[PDB]
């Protein structure tokens, strides 16, 4: 099923308590949504499906391009699909900067508030406010106001301090201001994308230098502010730029309270890879060549997109294993 | 918008009265649905989106494969999308044989009956019963019963007499039995896929030999049964196997009361064609070659699927022109 | 074997007397030479292998690019190969304009004169002087001098009046001047590339408009000058731009004394076509992909170049059939 | 120029004295010969071009396949080409087993004996007898007889003890028998392909385990037999299976008297690699697609084969650097 707010809060609470995390897979379509959920199910794992602003715009079609429309259309698709799987799937929206709040996060929040309102559950179970491009006090002012609105709609807010590369490098002051403005969950659950050298994309395995100790110190700074024991983990962290990371980097981040790792680039490669192979091996079936009419069985989009789906699903199971949520779905279907 | 039952009945009535037809485009995904609707809109045309049993199963994902689930999920996606376009879009299900009625058409009908029931409109605006593989009397017994159920749910039934190739060749007796069992619309609107040498797929332009005069004689046989003038067109015909047809064959069929032409193979080729081109020209970006890491900007599925969508949309505008429904949307947005 | 001068003169004399012609295939390499000769042999036909200035430069390698070197190296290769076939193969050099005479035709002629000289046969059996870019009187002054040198070396000269496209359109005056300056073979055999709308390359079958009647009138103009019967054919014509021609155009040209048709573009396509197919179907063998090491058996150049050779040979047999020299080799191996 | 026997003997003597070696590049065509020589020249290096039995058969064309013909035709091509470069190029024939001696090595030897005979130099400067599949005494009986014939024709003989993989692993007894039967050059220069775990082909960099100490001990065994100081290097070794070797393995082998390293697989990959890339990026130029006529400029074989040649040349310069013969041509063109 779709994760109810209560099961999503339980998911994140269990992950944190047990030092594991959930993959948050960026999807753009019926096929990628299907591939992601099948990956979660194959791994016996709960998971998160997220739509970026560009993914939602793509979802709405070239004749719309409207973020809300694409996010709603894909969310309604996903609600029908996820009901047929025995794992919990949460819906999330990814990075939304200040000038897109009015055309993405706020309207989607208002849609969920009205559902809630009528005794139903929200359409999405979390939304991201990415205020990292504005000064921290303004980021956190907007965050505080959005947190109240999200909590009232049974929705978890994700926020960001520090910029994810495409400085890097969240400061002590920012961690302290965050706890001061928002508390530690008593005013509504929030997820914190604190940056620690993360980069969106995949580079040669040497190139991206992560500093997970930044997360460890953020936990200590918060625990001190809250008068907690020094090993407490008051933040639920989000690891952006997950694709291309070393296993050891993922493991270390899990130790410091990462409960959600975002992956897009690697599942993109996984999806595309057998489509590429299909076109090459079937070149004279997918092209009308030398006066011939091609071969319908290989230019039928389903022929290669089933292969794309299965391949993306396999990469999603790898993410569930890497993050240690495989075999741990709160539905306990073993 | 999605076509209400009343506007769908008006669409088909207008098409018939004016000897034009609507394309019924087989879709399998968010992308193909988006491409089809954009094609209708670009042509200033109303249109039909249909899901085959295999398309619905594909729509539900490899971890489901359930026809109803895939059809419902794609229909809910389409409802959100179509609200953002100023043309009318009808949802249809394609060929359903006897042994799939209980797992496709009947459950979808029951879903629409309950919506109707609560004062709403049906989820799909028509469903196909393909009884061509059973004797005509059994075909038409099932048809009569389904027509009553469909009409009660504000849904148009499509039926088939004769087999579409992949004998061909609907008989006089079958036309007469059809009018006798079902009447001419007074007991509920139905669409008749009478076969006349149609073949699903595309072959070298010489190969498929259509006999539209079969449709002309079916109209005369019916008009005689109904005691109508000899030029009356009591049937609303469906042209299966539309891809690869000559313009002149399409024109002749329109003269005899074809109001709906099914196209799948040609929009498949149109969708796939630039994906093929994208993989070849970007071979060293979509593959990780010689120790390199590929190029995210070209293995991002959206990079080639936007090109697939636009290309399929162009082929859908061609179908609206070929069928003379371009520029004729009942919304009159000019 | 390589055609001796006497058998090459007999070849051209027989072709003319019987209204057939030989393909003159442009080659650039050991593989293309092998493909051309195998094509002649497979068709039971004699034939001509020719090297253009750019083909000879390519033949000499990127570290040389020297026309004479490439032509000599490829000619020596061909001498060894052709000795193993039971058809006659003539070696020719293609278009040489005025500013390349000193670095191509003249040095090659001097090489053959020295062989002849020592009681041997020339290295090439014909050379082309392409003077079509200079005024006709200068063209024919150079031609007369070259004809004397070529005849003394047992070599046939090809000349050109009119430009082959890439005006078109040889004039009556040019035909008359040619016979006046050079006679009709008594002063040494020459081949005349008279242009009649020929174009090098291949375009959509509609595009190139040939005017073979130009050749018919050139024969009549010459026969009148020589005081011969009006049906005499004093010229041995060369058909440039043979690729992409209609069969009917080829047939008509043969009626007017064409004894040699040049083909390059079509045998290029034939050679390349299965190399293309080989790379696509074996994409993950010819590329080192996803950390793998490729597959030697498919990146071995011989794997695809054997397929290229056989395919080019097949196109050369088609040319022997089109030109009616198939089955007519003067060796009479049946 | 082509290496005279005297300069080839000087080449090998200099390489041995200075612990460097020459690449022996397998070629199959005019293009690969051109690429190899340009590579030697670009590296300021002398080098060896070799033809295997299958390369010679391929060289002769599908209508011949005759080893002697292909080897002679390619050797005559190479003689013309190599005269235009300021480095020395030696011609060699690769592995010839017992049942091909009568149809490859022996006839080629007889051709060189007749040239020598008339006061000229041999056509090839070395030939390989591969007797590794027969017992050592028979191998060396044939070797002794061939060495006499080769030396009389001014030709160096290469022999093999141990099998190159596609046991591995030349024995002390075999080294001693070799020196006993053939001496150490006083009866004619020979090259010894002693095997030490070499494998033809390229595998993942981990897989092939070379044991160069086998060569070191073979030198000591020979030096002891000859009553020489223990650091003497009586054998001139040949390193088969050079492609895919680590630099450190190549360096170690050079220390023990390797003067010739055979490379084929890596120069195959280098040649093919840009042909592959050319076909993908120009897919709609090398194929006639969607009723179009392709693009001559990219299906002209020279368009991609010039790129193949330059790429293979670059890999040959890498081999000259790896083997430390770069910058050392005995022509001293700096
Ligand atoms: O903007 P997208 O759709 O490329 O995806 C966004 C995330 O993956 C990282 O910004
Ligand atoms: O079964 P599909 O999905 O290939 O499509 C069905 C129609 O297009 C014709 O049967
Ligand atoms: O110059 P090339 O090598 O392209 O060939 C020349 C002829 O085929 C026509 O000019
Ligand atoms: O037989 P080839 O032509 O594949 O080449 C032979 C050598 O490279 C190793 O046996
Ligand atoms: Na990343
Ligand atoms: Na069709
Ligand atoms: Na042409
Ligand atoms: Na090797
Ligand atoms: Zn991100
Ligand atoms: Zn459990
Ligand atoms: Zn159909
Ligand atoms: Zn209007
Ligand atoms: Zn020409
Ligand atoms: Zn005969
Ligand atoms: Zn070898
Ligand atoms: Zn020097």
Coordinates of N, CA and C and ligand atoms in Angstrom, one line a residue, chain A residues 296 300 302, chain B residues 26 28 50 52-56 94-95 200 240 262-265 268, ligand 2:
Chain A
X296 N 7.8 -4.8 -36.0 CA 6.9 -4.3 -35.0 C 7.2 -4.9 -33.6
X300 N 7.7 -2.0 -30.9 CA 6.7 -1.9 -29.8 C 7.5 -1.4 -28.6
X302 N 6.9 -1.4 -25.5 CA 6.9 -2.3 -24.4 C 8.1 -3.3 -24.5
Chain B
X26 N -3.8 3.5 -29.3 CA -3.4 2.6 -28.2 C -2.3 3.2 -27.4
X28 N 0.1 2.9 -23.5 CA 0.6 1.9 -22.5 C 1.3 2.5 -21.3
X50 N -7.1 4.4 -26.1 CA -7.5 3.1 -25.7 C -6.4 2.2 -25.1
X52 N -5.3 -1.8 -24.6 CA -5.5 -3.2 -24.9 C -5.3 -4.0 -23.6
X53 N -5.7 -5.3 -23.6 CA -5.4 -6.1 -22.4 C -3.9 -6.2 -22.1
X54 N -3.0 -6.3 -23.1 CA -1.6 -6.3 -22.9 C -1.0 -5.0 -22.5
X55 N -1.6 -3.9 -23.1 CA -1.2 -2.5 -22.7 C -1.6 -2.3 -21.2
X56 N -2.7 -2.7 -20.8 CA -3.2 -2.6 -19.4 C -2.3 -3.4 -18.5
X94 N -9.7 -1.8 -25.5 CA -9.6 -2.5 -26.8 C -9.9 -4.0 -26.6
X95 N -9.9 -4.8 -27.7 CA -10.3 -6.2 -27.8 C -10.3 -7.0 -26.5
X200 N -4.1 -6.0 -38.4 CA -3.3 -5.4 -37.4 C -1.8 -5.4 -37.8
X240 N -10.4 -1.2 -37.6 CA -9.3 -1.8 -36.9 C -8.1 -2.0 -37.9
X262 N -8.7 2.7 -35.4 CA -7.7 2.3 -34.4 C -6.3 2.4 -35.0
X263 N -5.4 3.1 -34.3 CA -4.0 3.0 -34.7 C -3.1 2.7 -33.5
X264 N -2.2 1.8 -33.7 CA -1.2 1.4 -32.7 C 0.2 1.3 -33.4
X265 N 0.3 0.4 -34.4 CA 1.7 0.1 -34.9 C 2.4 1.4 -35.4
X268 N 3.6 3.4 -32.5 CA 4.7 2.7 -31.9 C 6.0 3.1 -32.7
Ligands
LIG2 O1 -2.4 -6.4 -27.9 P1 -1.6 -5.1 -28.2 O2 -1.3 -4.4 -26.9 O3 -0.4 -5.5 -29.0 O4 -2.6 -4.2 -29.0 C1 -3.8 -4.7 -29.5 C2 -4.3 -4.0 -30.8 O5 -3.4 -2.9 -31.2 C3 -4.6 -5.0 -31.9 O6 -5.0 -6.3 -31.4

